[PDB]
């Protein structure tokens, strides 16, 4: 179970999260070497269960909401790597009057700048096309 595959059972292939292993022989015995992964130094933050922008709430697809004091981002659980809160990271369900402890902030659609740039180009084309 610890060699031909990767096992999720805790402490069954060494302390910490399990990665892989190697066997070794010994006189009337076996010695296992477990290669495993452990989290190092950590820092704390400020969290929030959900976010509400257009009266409705957003929940993270995977990861958690984090905030250093000024803005909010989405992070993987075991590695700090802040990212701007886009549409694809979150999904909406219901309005924001039910969740206890929700907090306010904005949500930025990744595709809205594309369509806004296209609208700006359309406005420029209209400005050019008014004269002829």
């Amino acid at each position: 179970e610890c060699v031909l595959g990767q096992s999720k059972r805790v402490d069954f292939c060494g302390k910490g999260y399990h990665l892989m292993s190697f066997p070794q022989s010994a006189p009337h015995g076996v010695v296992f070497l477990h290669v495993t992964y452990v989290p190092a130094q950590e820092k704390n933050f400020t969290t929030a269960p959900a976010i509400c922008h257009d009266g409705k709430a957003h929940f993270p697809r995977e990861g958690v909401f984090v905030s250093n004091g000024t803005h909010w981002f989405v992070t993987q659980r075991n590695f700090y790597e802040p990212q701007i809160i886009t549409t694809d990271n979150t999904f909406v369900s219901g309005n924001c009057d039910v969740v206890i402890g929700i907090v306010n902030n904005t949500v930025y659609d990744p595709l809205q700048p594309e369509l806004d740039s296209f609208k700006e180009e359309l406005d420029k084309y209209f400005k050019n096309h008014t004269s002829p």
Partner: peptide
């Protein structure tokens, strides 16, 4: 309203 997240990691080997 607070959690803690690790930024670095360590790799170890354990004998049995």
């Amino acid at each position: 309203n607070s959690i803690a997240i690790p930024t670095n990691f360590t790799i170890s080997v354990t004998t049995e």
